[PDB]
Amino acid sequence: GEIAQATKEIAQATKEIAKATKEIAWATKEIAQATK
Amino acid sequence: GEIAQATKEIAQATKEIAKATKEIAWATKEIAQATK
Amino acid sequence: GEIAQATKEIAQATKEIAKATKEIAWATKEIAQATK
Amino acid sequence: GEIAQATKEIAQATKEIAKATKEIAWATKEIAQATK
Amino acid sequence: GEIAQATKEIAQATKEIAKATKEIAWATKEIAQATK
Amino acid sequence: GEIAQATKEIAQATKEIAKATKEIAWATKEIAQATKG
């Protein structure tokens, strides 16, 4: 595609953002629970 | 075929980011409420 | 079509991310104000 | 129905995310500076 | 014409999000380092 | 030409967001582990 290449890269990067954002959610919930 | 597949994957990943970001918002609001 | 469907889903998810991110900003500002 | 319509909506939502993310950066810097 | 315009706007907004997200990462690392 | 250019720029920016978000996750996990006082 060539156009296709860029879109595939966005797809991959967005998956990595999803995974990292889930870890932030987990860690922020732990912080909230400790802060009482 | 290829652009369609990658776009579907972006859609799925962005939905997962939305869900995780909502949990971060909830947890950060709890932290804010505890700090006062 | 398929690209149309996926693009609509990205649009919806990105709107939800916008809303959640604005709440994170509000809550983080309140945390900053409490920390003096 | 349109790809154009959905893409415009993504554009608008991403601008709102940009604005909110800049506020998170400001507020997180203030928190960091207070934590010494 | 319309898809092109919206895509350019997404590109610009995503660059601004990148810059802000890098600052959040820097500030959060400083918080982590202070918390020992 | 123009759609291609803008899409490449989105790709690059999203990669930078991915890298920064991973660092936020790491740092937030360290904060969580410290708050385990």
For residue A18, what are its two tokens?
């999803």
- Quick one: how far is CA C29 from the chain centroid? 16
How was this entry determined? X-ray
Considering Cα of F17, then F23, then F26, then F30, what sign does the dihedral take?
A: negative
> In Å, what resolution does this model reach?
1.9
Is A27 an interface residue toward F (CB < 8 Å)?
A: yes
For residue E30, what are its two tokens?
């400083």
End-to-end alpha carbon distance in chain F? 56
Structural contact between residues B7 and A9, judged by C-beta atoms closer than 8 angstroms: no
Rounded CA separation A33/B26 (Å): 12
Rounded CA separation A20/C36 (Å): 30
Chain B environment of A32 (Cβ under 8 Å): 27-28, 30-31, 34
Cβ separation E31–D36 shorter than 8 A: no
A22: containing domain: 1-36
Rounded CA separation C13/A17 (Å): 14
Q: Which residue of E has its CA nearest to F12?
A: E15
Structural contact between residues A17 and F14, judged by C-beta atoms closer than 8 angstroms: yes
Closest CA to D31 of F27, A26, A23: F27
Count: domains in chain F = 1
Closest CA to B18 of C9, E3, E32: C9
Q: Amino acid identity of F34?
A: A
Give the gap in angstroms from C-alpha A26 to the nearest C-alpha of chain B: 8
Rounded CA separation A29/E25 (Å): 18
Considering Cα of F23, then D20, then D29, then B24, what sign does the dihedral take?
A: negative
Rounded CA separation C32/A25 (Å): 19
Work out the number of other CB atoms within 10 angstroms of the CB of residue F16: 17
DSSP F6-33: HHHHHHHHHHHHHHHHHHHHHHHHHHHH
3-state DSSP assignment of residue C20: helix
Q: What is the DSSP letter of A8?
A: H
